Amino acid sequence: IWLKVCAASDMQPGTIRRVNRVGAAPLAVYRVGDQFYATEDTCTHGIASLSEGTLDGDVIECPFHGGAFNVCTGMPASSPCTVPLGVFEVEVKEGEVYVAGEKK
Amino acid sequence: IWLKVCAASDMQPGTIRRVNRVGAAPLAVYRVGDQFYATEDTCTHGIASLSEGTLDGDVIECPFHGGAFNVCTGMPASSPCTVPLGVFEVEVKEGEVYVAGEKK
Amino acid sequence: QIWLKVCAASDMQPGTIRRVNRVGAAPLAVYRVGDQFYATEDTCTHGIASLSEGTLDGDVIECPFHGGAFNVCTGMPASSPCTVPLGVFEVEVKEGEVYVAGEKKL
Amino acid sequence: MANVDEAILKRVKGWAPYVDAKLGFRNHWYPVMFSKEINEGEPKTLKLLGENLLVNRIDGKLYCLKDRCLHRGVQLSVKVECKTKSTITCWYHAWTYRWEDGVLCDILTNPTSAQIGRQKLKTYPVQEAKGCVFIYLGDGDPPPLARDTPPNFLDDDMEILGKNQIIKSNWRLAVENGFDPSHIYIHKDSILVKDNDLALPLGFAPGGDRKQQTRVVDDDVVGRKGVYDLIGEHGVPVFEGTIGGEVVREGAYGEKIVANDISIWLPGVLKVNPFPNPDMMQFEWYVPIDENTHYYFQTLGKPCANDEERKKYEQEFESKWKPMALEGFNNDDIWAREAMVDFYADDKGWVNEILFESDEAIVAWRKLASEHNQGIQTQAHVSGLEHHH
Amino acid sequence: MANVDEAILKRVKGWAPYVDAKLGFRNHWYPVMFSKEINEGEPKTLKLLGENLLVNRIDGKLYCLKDRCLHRGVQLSVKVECKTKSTITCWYHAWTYRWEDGVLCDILTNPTSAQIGRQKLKTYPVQEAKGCVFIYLGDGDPPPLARDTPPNFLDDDMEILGKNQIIKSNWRLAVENGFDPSHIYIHKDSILVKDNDLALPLGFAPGGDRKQQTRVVDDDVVGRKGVYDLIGEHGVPVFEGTIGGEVVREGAYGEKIVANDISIWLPGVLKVNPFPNPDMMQFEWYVPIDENTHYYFQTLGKPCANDEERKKYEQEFESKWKPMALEGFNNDDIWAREAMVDFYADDKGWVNEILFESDEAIVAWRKLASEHNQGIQTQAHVSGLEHHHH
Amino acid sequence: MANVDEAILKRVKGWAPYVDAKLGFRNHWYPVMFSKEINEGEPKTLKLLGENLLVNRIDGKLYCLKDRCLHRGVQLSVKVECKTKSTITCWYHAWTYRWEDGVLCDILTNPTSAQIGRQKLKTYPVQEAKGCVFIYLGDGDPPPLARDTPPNFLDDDMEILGKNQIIKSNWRLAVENGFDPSHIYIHKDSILVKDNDLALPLGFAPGGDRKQQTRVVDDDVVGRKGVYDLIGEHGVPVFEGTIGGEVVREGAYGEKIVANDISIWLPGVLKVNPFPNPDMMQFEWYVPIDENTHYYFQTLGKPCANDEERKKYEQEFESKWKPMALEGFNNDDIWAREAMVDFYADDKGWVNEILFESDEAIVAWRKLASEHNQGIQTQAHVSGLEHHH
Numbered sequence A, B: 001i002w003l004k005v006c007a008a009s010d011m012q013p014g015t016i017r018r019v020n021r022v023g024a025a026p027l028a029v030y031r032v033g034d035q036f037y038a039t040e041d042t043c044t045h046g047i048a049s050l051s052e053g054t055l056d057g058d059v060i061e062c063p064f065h066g067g068a069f070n071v072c073t074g075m076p077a078s079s080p081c082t083v084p085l086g087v088f089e090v091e092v093k094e095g096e097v098y099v100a101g102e103k104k
Numbered sequence C: 001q002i003w004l005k006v007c008a009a010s011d012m013q014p015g016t017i018r019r020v021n022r023v024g025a026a027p028l029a030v031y032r033v034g035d036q037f038y039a040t041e042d043t044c045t046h047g048i049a050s051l052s053e054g055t056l057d058g059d060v061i062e063c064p065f066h067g068g069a070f071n072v073c074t075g076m077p078a079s080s081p082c083t084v085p086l087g088v089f090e091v092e093v094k095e096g097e098v099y100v101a102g103e104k105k106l
Numbered sequence D, F: 001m002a003n004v005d006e007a008i009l010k011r012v013k014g015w016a017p018y019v020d021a022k023l024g025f026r027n028h029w030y031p032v033m034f035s036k037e038i039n040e041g042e043p044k045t046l047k048l049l050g051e052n053l054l055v056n057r058i059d060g061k062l063y064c065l066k067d068r069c070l071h072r073g074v075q076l077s078v079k080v081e082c083k084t085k086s087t088i089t090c091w092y093h094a095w096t097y098r099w100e101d102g103v104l105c106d107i108l109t110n111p112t113s114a115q116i117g118r119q120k121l122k123t124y125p126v127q128e129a130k131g132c133v134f135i136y137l138g139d140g141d142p143p144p145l146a147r148d149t150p151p152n153f154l155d156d157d158m159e160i161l162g163k164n165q166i167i168k169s170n171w172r173l174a175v176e177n178g179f180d181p182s183h184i185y186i187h188k189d190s191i192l193v194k195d196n197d198l199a200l201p202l203g204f205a206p207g208g209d210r211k212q213q214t215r216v217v218d219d220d221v222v223g224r225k226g227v228y229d230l231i232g233e234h235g236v237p238v239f240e241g242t243i244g245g246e247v248v249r250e251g252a253y254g255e256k257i258v259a260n261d262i263s264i265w266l267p268g269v270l271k272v273n274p275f276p277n278p279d280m281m282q283f284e285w286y287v288p289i290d291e292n293t294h295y296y297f298q299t300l301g302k303p304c305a306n307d308e309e310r311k312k313y314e315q316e317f318e319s320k321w322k323p324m325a326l327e328g329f330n331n332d333d334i335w336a337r338e339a340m341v342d343f344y345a346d347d348k349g350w351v352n353e354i355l356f357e358s359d360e361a362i363v364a365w366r367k368l369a370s371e372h373n374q375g376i377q378t379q380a381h382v383s384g385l386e387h388h389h
Numbered sequence E: 001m002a003n004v005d006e007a008i009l010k011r012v013k014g015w016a017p018y019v020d021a022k023l024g025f026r027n028h029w030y031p032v033m034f035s036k037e038i039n040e041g042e043p044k045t046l047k048l049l050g051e052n053l054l055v056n057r058i059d060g061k062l063y064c065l066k067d068r069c070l071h072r073g074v075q076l077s078v079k080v081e082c083k084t085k086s087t088i089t090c091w092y093h094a095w096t097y098r099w100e101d102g103v104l105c106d107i108l109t110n111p112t113s114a115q116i117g118r119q120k121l122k123t124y125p126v127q128e129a130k131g132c133v134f135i136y137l138g139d140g141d142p143p144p145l146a147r148d149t150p151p152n153f154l155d156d157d158m159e160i161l162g163k164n165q166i167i168k169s170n171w172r173l174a175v176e177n178g179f180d181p182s183h184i185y186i187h188k189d190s191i192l193v194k195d196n197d198l199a200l201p202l203g204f205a206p207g208g209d210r211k212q213q214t215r216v217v218d219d220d221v222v223g224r225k226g227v228y229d230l231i232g233e234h235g236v237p238v239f240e241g242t243i244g245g246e247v248v249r250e251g252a253y254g255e256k257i258v259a260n261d262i263s264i265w266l267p268g269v270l271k272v273n274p275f276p277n278p279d280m281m282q283f284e285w286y287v288p289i290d291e292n293t294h295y296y297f298q299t300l301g302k303p304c305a306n307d308e309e310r311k312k313y314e315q316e317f318e319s320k321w322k323p324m325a326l327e328g329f330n331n332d333d334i335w336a337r338e339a340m341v342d343f344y345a346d347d348k349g350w351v352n353e354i355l356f357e358s359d360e361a362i363v364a365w366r367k368l369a370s371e372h373n374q375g376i377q378t379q380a381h382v383s384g385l386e387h388h389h390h
């Protein structure tokens, strides 16, 4: 069920990686420091890709209108975003990053 | 004639005390440092009670529009006030505060 | 008329301006920046103001009418609304006397 | 929140929120039209608290959606396209919304769009009562309509009839004029005074203490918040007007005693009882449309026990009360409000006004409104709330 | 007194106060109407320096009260209620004021109010002279009217006639246009030129030095402060306008010599002598109404020794002078003023204008006005002065 | 720069320059009128990018001078005085300028003035091509006109006919509407559809990835910069519009296939090909007049080899294409643009808009415009550039 995304070392701190899933909406995996988080990639306010946004701490800023989300809770951090982002649990085992197959 | 307000002890410096008089308009007693002063309680710019205002040094600020008066002279200190306030003589005999029956 | 006698170099303090009137011609302005001397037309190119009545900040003269400014060395505009460059006049000191050219450079 | 210069709000410590509420109070019910004005499947437009809204009646029930497409922000009403009974489709790119919950249920120009079912157009509760349409311009589950209506307006036997129109003045100027004890002076020559033989003083000389001049109601069985004008309980009615000791005017010495029970209630509705006749009551709202205008929603209520009395009342309303009272009496209130616009337009009147005794009623209202309103409508509510982390 | 961007004021070091005086100068007399326009017991409204005022005539004397009730700030004029000869009662809550001192003497809605006798509505001095109504828009006892009038306007024998109207431009643009030596060019086709056989150049080629271009008056015994335009004393008048050396326009070669003595005086009144005829004078004010408008108060003076001459003067004024001069000549000044509105509307024109020689007269005026005005009217004066005496 | 609140510009990181360009882009050619509209010695006034301009034809050639005297800043056009063929004299103090270079060559009111020959009124390059008058609202030597025109507009045999008018909306709203793939929905009832037997979908269901939705052109030889709308190359056109799965509207099933080649180019000109007929092309500009208005400069081009064909095309244009297409089809675009004014008027729409898939085209345009525009027109350009040493 879990999706093996990449090696933890494949991501530099403060970067975002888009994860495409055939037959499903893409996800965004964020590396904040040495921690990893995951959410749907599409901003809930439009069609922007959050993986192309700006990560400030644990808050992702959308590249389109400056809306923002806390990548840990998925809750909006800045307007105009109002709809919470879907969140996916992430697990790092033996240096490999895995993301839950289903939102939760 | 002279009316008994309170004991100098009952008032901390920088505080105000309203003096309701039977069959007459109210007065306001102010303790500036270790000196006591008195004026009409009603702001000359309207119907506000200066006793509900804020004292800064020897200047009382009206709570309704922010006008102000010098409590020693009764002269306007801040707009929109323009009409001087009525001042009443105060006397501290035996650590007790008394206010004159009529304005000086 | 090639070289016009202005004054003794000693007569000008650093950072001052002196107006040089000329019969039949427009007045000039001589500036002393440090121990060096420069000159331009006295009339601001943006209007009818007299630059010798303005304020000299280093090598930049500010017009007293609208705040426009020029670089006294090149005559080029330094601040809006000025846009037309000033004519620059060569200045030389001979025997302690300041002389300004009667014709602008170039 | 933040609608007026901070320097001004800092000065009016007694009622800063009220002075800041130029656009009205959010999270309250407001009447905007009469039930008979909106028919089945015929959407109607209106602006309330600065927001453009659309109201529709479907299967007899009213629904309200914000009249602004989520996509490019155009008003859906520019070209209404209700393609199915339960939805409305934007004329631009066909984004389709359900009247019931505002959900974006379809997009004709792209049925595969990921936005479908992931966005929602703002909706507001709508309730009809006494032939009036009330909209809860607020967020979350609404409180009972009774909280925002004066006592007795919703009484079972109370027959309500009225009129509504748009007036060019901020809503607060309207409220204050209505609750102003001394403004009665402007009505001295009203046709109603003579034609309905009303006793009407020019004003009142206050008596007792200022605390007794009004009575604030901080809570009702339904959460109502209001103020009663009690200037007449210890005051002396002034019937003769004098200048330098000489009589220059007289009040009306009619036999009918009216308006001895006046109260103002949040969000801004006045109750005058009895008026314009000893057996009637007047309830009027001053509804904020935008910072410069309001709906003057007038209603006259009379208890009716049967259909015979209701029919009779309606006849009397149309032939007498509407033209003689609602128009003949209140028309002077309209230009009075308009006359106060300039002084308060720059927000400076809130600092420079010189109040006198009868204004204790207005001050009580300003404080009550400041302490118990359910929210300050801001321009950001109109364009879209903003917060930058 | 902060009416303009501080960055702009810092730039115009020669006349900053003037640029800041968008609302006009307080503490000066200003004409607002003619005496015959205000009748006994009939209050009239008007706006001066941004303030709404009411003027009334009682027993023949004029009185001026601010047209804004102290209570809720409504204009008393919305519904005028003068219930006794000496008072006016606000139509709203009946606060009553005395015309003579503005004192709140009664309140019909509450004759027991503590405000009675304690509050006072603003009053302004009013004086009638030469059939004109002047209001002292200022505080404290007023100075003599002569201080704010041009020389000879108040001469016993000087018969004054004129017209007044509201023009859409800031008062300063009107003043500068009027005192502008080179603007004479816009009058080259005026019917007055041909119809009154005037000699009128197209412009002037200045002569002499800067100081000789004008005469700044600041030592007048009556306190008058103004500037005389002396461009014609050393200048060569232009009668043949050329382009590329080729003549494209000529001035007027009439016999009547006029307008060779022009002067501007605070608070903003122009004197043109002799005009429109060799035996007359023109006096015109540009009175501030608000930042976008002004009264164009025009008057023509002609010495008259008796009722016979005064009647003839009146007939000629009505049949010739008013139509041919005040309108036929000055109408072009009106749209000229309006044409400058946009450039100065954002205050930027005060920085970007490119002046030429004849504007020396305008600069002198700007400096005189900046140094000798009696006060800068501010929006706070209009709404209510604001301060904290610290 | 400094046209929009910095807080807003900081939010739209992907296209801030574009959002800031409320007055348009400086240093680009813009069509403002047709050649036949400006006659010899008959100066005409116009406002472009917020600047008042004067255009005149002398010996057949067009000249453009800023309509604002250097002296006291009045418009020369208030009272035009062209005393000599090569000059114009300000009606106020007679400062005279040459149309050819704007140099102040004379001053009738003072022949001795030191300003003569030392001041210069702003002039702008003007060029006539295809019967259209283009003005280069920029500084320095202008680039070839071809850089600011869509492909084929300047083709040797392309006959251009058109119409121009002033529309009340910011130019960007006009540009986006024109290039908006899904706005085709507003044209479903246009008389052109039925009257010219057009095939016209209601919208599109996109296919493929983002990169495939458009083709950004930044490698054109003449230097033109633009974007092609390729939504139809992988997308399934929508002909049956549904709500809840039920068909409520259908597209047009005409035989004529048109507008399958759509591109937008800087400074803001759209090319639709073929349209309104399989053998024609439409080129339209949305020229900035001021922050609130633009010229809707419409042109239709059709190859013509000689006079007989050109004449035939002209007759068809007047009797059919102009009324049926330019007006009958595009009139809906005009009110659509106007409908977006409010949302974007406070600059907040640039932040609050909720976009969907087809807007990928608009986004590409915003990014291209932001990166390749030749300068942002500012209010300072209008009043006079400012700089402090």
Ligand code: FES
Pocket (backbone or CB within 6 Å): A043, A044, A045, A046, A047, A048, A062, A063, A064, A065, A066, A067, A068, A079, A080, A081
């Ligand atoms: S698309 Fe992300 S903030 Fe708008």
Ligand code: FES
Pocket (backbone or CB within 6 Å): B043, B044, B045, B046, B047, B048, B062, B063, B064, B065, B066, B067, B068, B079, B080, B081
């Ligand atoms: S009532 Fe005191 S400042 Fe107004």
Ligand code: FES
Pocket (backbone or CB within 6 Å): C044, C045, C046, C047, C048, C049, C063, C064, C065, C066, C067, C068, C069, C080, C081, C082, E351
């Ligand atoms: S005259 Fe020097 S800046 Fe204008």
Ligand code: FES
Pocket (backbone or CB within 6 Å): D069, D070, D071, D072, D073, D074, D090, D091, D092, D093, D094, D095
């Ligand atoms: S603006 Fe309503 S669907 Fe696009």
Ligand code: FES
Pocket (backbone or CB within 6 Å): E069, E070, E071, E072, E073, E074, E090, E091, E092, E093, E094, E095
């Ligand atoms: S506003 Fe004039 S008496 Fe109240």
Ligand code: FES
Pocket (backbone or CB within 6 Å): F069, F070, F071, F072, F073, F074, F090, F091, F092, F093, F094, F095
């Ligand atoms: S404003 Fe044009 S010559 Fe003076």
Ligand SMILES: [Fe+2]
Pocket (backbone or CB within 6 Å): D177, D178, D183, D184, D187, D330, D333
């Ligand atoms: Fe009333």
Ligand SMILES: [Fe+2]
Pocket (backbone or CB within 6 Å): E177, E178, E183, E184, E187, E330, E333
């Ligand atoms: Fe003139």
Ligand SMILES: [Fe+2]
Pocket (backbone or CB within 6 Å): F177, F178, F183, F184, F187, F330, F333
């Ligand atoms: Fe279209």
